[PDB]
Structure 1
Amino acid sequence: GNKICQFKLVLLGESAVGKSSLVLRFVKGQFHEFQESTIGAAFLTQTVCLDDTTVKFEIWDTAGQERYHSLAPMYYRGAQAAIVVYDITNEESFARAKNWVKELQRQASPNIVIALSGNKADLANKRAVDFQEAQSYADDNSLLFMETSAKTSMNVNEIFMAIAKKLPK
């Protein structure tokens, strides 16, 4: 019966890799508050309590701006965790993800916990990004890495749980 720590966590990745779907699937299976948004609904926020911990995430998600632009300094500000998502059936989304990571590390504090999500791992029959290639990049850059499926829920909870485990207290 002690102190809840709150951490801002931001979603990053090309349009259409499933960032929003991941947030929603995760949220669906945890205690959470009603979704909110910022002015003009430029960014969508949702608060969620991770089961059997005293970790509360304030998860930030975009409203699609990724397909046109970089993301604003406001989006990054305060983030203590990130999930950078790519689509395992799209090499391009993987190459791009590497750049979201660099952009992230440059904009965020040195102790941010970054997880790399190889999403749509349920389309294994259309895999275009090899697991060990992502894992090697992830290891070389101190990133947590898992393959996920927002659709089937595979590893959705556990990538959030993995992050929580690396966060302070």
Structure 2
Amino acid sequence: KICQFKLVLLGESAVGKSSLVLRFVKGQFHEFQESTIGAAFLTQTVCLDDTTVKFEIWDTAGQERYHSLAPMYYRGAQAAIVVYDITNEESFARAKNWVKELQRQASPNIVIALSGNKADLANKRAVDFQEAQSYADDNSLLFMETSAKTSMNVNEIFMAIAKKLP
């Protein structure tokens, strides 16, 4: 049994989308990742136990100018990860708008995941875990704090998407 699908990462610039993907796919973490131009594409096949799951991954440039293009990436996607920096409250609200957009534009069946990334930088956490958890529960969003730096909960959230995927 082969189940490949399309997944899109969305979020304000510099919250760690690419890093997160580099982690999951190539198991790397670059400290000085440069801002994505337009978007990046990578794939990754991970088996759950018996069935093989292929991730077609679109990592979008997060800067505001690229906002109107986003649909050309998420349209026809069965999964999404909206990412924010837990040390940035503004990047958490911006993340809220991405969720509302997907809920309005994208398929109703899409599995959305919310990532509070840079959990390793809790030294200056500006977004309470419990408030992010709560926001998620109400919107039925798989939430999970992650660290592209330490790899904390990186593989899980991807793995958790695959299982929740119909």
TM-score of the pair, normalised by structure 2: 0.85
CA distance in 1, matches of 2:105, 2:115: 20
The one of 74, 88, 91 aligned to 1:90: 88
| Structure 1 vs Structure 2 CA RMSD | 4.6
Shift of residue 52 of structure 1? 6.9
Q: Return 24-33 or 103-112, whichever deviates more.
A: 24-33
Secondary structure, counterpart of 1:94 in structure 2:
helix
Deviations 1:87-118 (A, max 9, x none): 00000000110000011111211110011000
In structure 1, list runs of 5 or more residues that go unmatched: none
Q: Return 94-103 or 63-72, whichever deviates more.
A: 63-72
Shift of residue 73 of structure 1? 2.5
Q: Return 45-54 or 28-37, whichever deviates more.
A: 28-37
CA distance in 2, matches of 1:162, 1:63: 24
**Distance of aligned partners of 1:39 and 1:145 in 2 relative to their CA distance in 1, 3 Å threshold:** closer
CA contact (8 A) 1:113 1:163 kept: yes
Deviations 1:6-65 (A, max 9, x none): 110000000000001101100024999999999987767777767875111101012455
CA distance in 1, matches of 2:39, 2:81: 21
**Distance of aligned partners of 1:41 and 1:155 in 2 relative to their CA distance in 1, 3 Å threshold:** closer
In structure 2, list runs of 5 or more residues that go unmatched: none
**Distance of aligned partners of 1:125 and 1:31 in 2 relative to their CA distance in 1, 3 Å threshold:** closer
**Distance of aligned partners of 1:126 and 1:30 in 2 relative to their CA distance in 1, 3 Å threshold:** closer
- Structure 1 consecutive aligned stretches of length 4 or more whose deviation exceeds 2 Å: 29-53, 63-73
TM-score of the pair, normalised by structure 1: 0.83
**Distance of aligned partners of 1:149 and 1:80 in 2 relative to their CA distance in 1, 3 Å threshold:** same
Q: Return 10-19 or 58-67, whichever deviates more.
A: 58-67
The one of 50, 53, 56 aligned to 2:48: 50
Count matched residues: 166
Secondary structure, counterpart of 2:126 in structure 1:
coil
Q: Return 62-71 or 73-82, whichever deviates more.
A: 62-71
CA contact (8 A) 2:82 2:113 kept: yes
**Distance of aligned partners of 1:6 and 1:43 in 2 relative to their CA distance in 1, 3 Å threshold:** closer
Percent of pairs identical after alignment? 100
Q: Return 65-74 or 148-157, whichever deviates more.
A: 65-74
Secondary structure, counterpart of 2:57 in structure 1:
strand
CA contact (8 A) 2:19 2:30 kept: no
